[PDB]
Design goal:
By secondary structure, the chain is mainly beta. It has one helix at 146-155; strands at 5-10, 15-20, 25-31, 35-42, 50-61, 64-73, 77-85, 93-100, 103-117, 120-132, 142-145, 163-174, 177-184. It has a single domain, classed as Glycoside hydrolase family 11/12, catalytic domain (Jelly Rolls, Sandwich). Helix content is 5%, strand content 64%. A hairpin with a 2-residue loop joins strand 8 and strand 9. It is globular. The structure holds a molecule of 2 linked components (DFX-XYP). Belongs to the glycosyl hydrolase 11 (cellulase G) family.
Length: 185
């Protein structure tokens, strides 16, 4: 699919050099950052979407995630399917596991209080996570069958909102540097 959305958020720390490339392609070169999330995807997420990507460069030098990333409202939820990371594997309150697309993911919840969201600078929301138990290889075509995650999350009382906002294959970083280049379809 053609991507129709460009995600490019930074809280303003350090430098985030985000390139909105051709088609579903983007690149990030980041340095000594605060918090940021950059990616390509779709303006309106769907629990039925199958996201394909190829991370031609996955080169974090510190804390970074290579992850499906998106939001719902009603309720406000930020969600993740993390396939790779840098120095630190993201974790939270363990709920169970789901197997999907050749990997086994732990299912976590965490919460943010008075934090930035699509609803404002200072808001409170639950974060839903599938995090691969070990890093997915990069450089070849990879699929995230998002419906497997949605259903597994439901089985653990993690229900997504009825109002879907954007849904992207992202590079997120925190207090780190690195490079990425990713193509999404
Ligand atoms: C998950 O990722 C980073 C941040 O989400 C941003 O919030 C502000 C909004 O305008 C952007 O589109 C989001 O990327 C959130 O605090 C964190 F929980």
């Amino acid at each position: 699919a053609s991507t129709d959305y460009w995600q490019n958020w930074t809280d303003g720390g350090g430098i985030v050099n985000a390139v909105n490339g051709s088609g579903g392609n983007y690149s990030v070169n980041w340095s000594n950052t605060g918090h940021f999330v950059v990616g390509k995807g779709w303006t309106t997420g769907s629990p039925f979407r199958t996201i394909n990507y190829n991370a031609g460069v996955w080169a974090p030098n510190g804390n970074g995630y290579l992850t499906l990333y998106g939001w719902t409202r009603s309720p406000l939820i930020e969600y993740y399917v993390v396939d790779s990371w840098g120095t630190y594997r993201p974790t939270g309150t363990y709920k169970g596991t789901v197997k999907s697309d050749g990997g086994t993911y732990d299912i976590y919840t965490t919460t943010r209080y008075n934090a930035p969201s699509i609803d404002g600078d200072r808001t409170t929301f639950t974060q839903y996570w599938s995090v691969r138990q070990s890093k997915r290889p990069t450089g070849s075509n990879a699929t995230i069958t998002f419906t497997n995650h949605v259903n597994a999350w439901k089985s653990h009382g993690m229900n997504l909102g009825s109002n879907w906002a954007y849904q992207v294959m992202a590079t997120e970083g925190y207090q780190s540097s690195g490079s990425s280049n990713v193509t999404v379809w």
